[PDB]
């Protein structure tokens, strides 16, 4: 199918408690493969997937250098943003950045991304054309003017259309055992009486990869979107994901409800019912 590569970065200041903490992680699809934490004993970028371990020492050296450089620029940016927003130096503030690329089945670029947030709010984002910016407020418009004068988008476009895609393709091949394997969900329906007049039906999906999935309850064939309780998809800790969806049904009407599961690992979407 299609695939993605993303690098995530967070810097958090902590006045009176040293310099900002910086954490960055890299993902291919829903698989973590590298990490760097400025508070680690001897901070280096470290592998987190078996298929990246074969990269040589100069790969690791370069990556580590980049991570440390980004940590330093983020420290400078946190000080700048205090000025842009007329903020005190007393508080903790957060800078987040994500960038990366999506490719289709043939490996061609579908689109690239580079976007930032300050204190949890959109700040500036590269537009899909990879040539212009969307700034969220007048503070971000100052960064926009700076990055336009510096021709930042031209450099990012080159990376996103080139290296990003090329290296994603390399990782997909080196990790094809796992990155190109979809694990379908193991599914079942449980039944829990609430009272003499009502019962909970819960539809489970376990052990699936990648994380994208659709679980829906139907009553007499109609989607129960507003009466379905749907938890966030959650990691099992072993590469796979879990999810459930629950409805409250009048006692005796359980057979009018069906749970529908769509996942890229399934050849056909599944229909399940409670089996007493």
């Amino acid at each position: 199918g299609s695939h993605s590569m993303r690098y995530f970065h967070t810097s958090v200041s902590r006045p009176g408690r040293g310099e900002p903490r910086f954490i960055t992680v890299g993902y291919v699809d829903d698989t973590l493969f590298v990490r760097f934490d400025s508070d680690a004993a001897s901070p280096r970028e470290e592998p987190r997937a078996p298929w990246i371990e074969q990269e040589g020492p100069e790969y690791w050296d370069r990556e580590t250098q980049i991570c440390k450089a980004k940590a330093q620029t983020d420290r400078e940016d946190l000080r700048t943003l205090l000025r842009y927003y007329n903020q005190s130096e007393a508080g903790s503030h957060t800078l987040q950045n994500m960038y990366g690329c999506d490719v289709g089945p043939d490996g061609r670029l579908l689109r690239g991304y580079h976007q930032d947030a300050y204190d949890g709010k959109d700040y500036i984002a590269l537009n899909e054309d990879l040539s212009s910016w969307t700034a969220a407020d007048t503070a971000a418009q100052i960064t926009q003017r700076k990055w336009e004068a510096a021709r930042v988008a031209e450099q990012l476009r080159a990376y996103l259309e080139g290296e990003c895609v090329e290296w994603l393709r390399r990782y997909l091949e080196n990790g094809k055992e796992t990155l190109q394997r979809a694990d379908p969900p193991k599914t079942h329906v449980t039944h829990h009486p609430i009272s003499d007049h009502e019962a909970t039906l819960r539809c489970w999906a376990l052990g699936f990869y990648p994380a994208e999935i659709t679980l829906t309850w139907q009553r007499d064939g109609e989607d129960q979107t507003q009466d379905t309780e749907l938890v966030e998809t959650r990691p099992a800790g072993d590469r796979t994901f879990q999810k459930w969806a629950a409805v409250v049904v009048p006692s005796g009407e359980e057979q009018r409800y069906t749970c529908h599961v769509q996942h890229e690992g399934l050849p056909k979407p599944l229909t399940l019912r409670w089996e007493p």
């Binding site: 690098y7 890299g26 790969y59 990556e63 980049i66 991570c67 450089a69 980004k70 620029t73 400078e76 940016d77 700048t80 943003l81 960038y99 930032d116 960064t143 700076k146 990055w147 510096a150 930042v152 450099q155 990012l156 990376y159 290296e163 990003c164 290296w167």
Partner: peptide, 10 residues
């Protein structure tokens, strides 16, 4: 493989 500009300060 990560990107690094060859200034990107905000």
């Amino acid at each position: 493989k990560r990107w690094i500009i060859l200034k990107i300060v905000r």
